[PDB]
């Protein structure tokens, strides 16, 4: 039931067969997303430190957030984008808590109850729970507590598909600078990079196909809450958006350092 996003023809995903047949959707407010990325970089330089050669969720045509949370509420896009960009920077001391406080104040002013759920998920660390806090806040979703255990267990497949794809597309630039799936497969099977890569692709397609099927069944049954279903359906655009973004995003392009 789409109100804020747009489906994009990107025929290379069919040839790549990593996202099953999940379409690419992109939030139409890419401009707000970039504004929140710029502000996060301005605050980081202001409070934390200088940034040189850093690239986060910005891609040449769309950003990470607009492809992966395509139905993100427009008035929440900047904040959601800022928080995603800040998590990218944090992953790569007084100012950090000052930036966090500001972000917390902006979130509480938008959605008090759902900022608390989100913060709870973000204190645990597990990257599952970061994306869980961000998506639920970005789309103003309230997962019934009786459904949470089941919803999170189901979403794990989409997190694995996107997580492994990420490592697949980040290994090259990461090696040039390992805690990557390609390296583990190169230990266990003692194989070359391209052979670990083909094994990784097999696993990605398993996880992706299982997720697509489960979400189809749950949607067809309509016995879970609309917010749980909306969260799970966002899991699908997170797989297609992650992959499409990975193709050309500066973060993983060797052309940068």
Residue numbers in the entry: 2 to 93, 124 to 156, 183 to 234, 243 to 322
What did the original publication write about this model?
In this study, two fungal chimeric class I TrTSs, Talaromyces verruculosus talaropentaene synthase (TvTS) and Macrophomina phaseolina macrophomene synthase (MpMS), were characterized. Both enzymes use dimethylallyl diphosphate and isopentenyl diphosphate or hexaprenyl diphosphate as substrates, representing the first examples, to our knowledge, of non-squalene-dependent triterpene biosynthesis. Structural analyses of the terpene cyclase domain of TvTS and full-length MpMS provide detailed insights into their catalytic mechanisms. In summary, a novel family of chimeric class I TrTSs converting HexPP into triterpenes was identified for which two subclasses can be distinguished.
Because recombinant full-length TvTS was insoluble, for in vitro assays the TvTS-PT and TvTS-TC domains were expressed individually. The structural basis of the cyclization mechanism was investigated by determination of the crystal structure of apo TvTS-TC by soaking with the non-reactive substrate surrogate 2,3-dihydro-HexPP. Although 2,3-dihydro-HexPP was not clearly observed and we cannot completely exclude the possibility that the observed electron density originated from polyethylene glycol (PEG) used in the crystallization buffer, the disordered regions in the apo structure, especially the DDXXD motif and the active site loop D173–D182, appeared clearly structured following soaking with the substrate surrogate. This observation suggests that a major conformational change occurs in TvTS following substrate binding that facilitates active site closure. The TvTS active site contains the conserved DDXXD and NSE motifs and other residues that interact with the substrate’s diphosphate. Aromatic residues in TvTS-TC (F65, F89, F187, W188 and W310) are observed in positions analogous to those in PaFS (F65, F89, F196, W197 and W319), while the PaFS residues at the bottom of the active site (M221, W225, M309, S312 and N316) are substituted with smaller residues in TvTS (A212, Y216, G300, G303 and S307). These differences create a larger pocket in TvTS-TC that is composed of a tunnel to accommodate two additional (non-reacting) isoprene units of HexPP, sticking out from a ball-shaped cavity in which the four reacting isoprene units are located. The high similarity between the AlphaFold2-predicted model and the crystal structure of TvTS-TC offers a basis for the discovery of additional chimeric fungal TrTSs through structural prediction, which is not possible from amino acid sequence analyses.
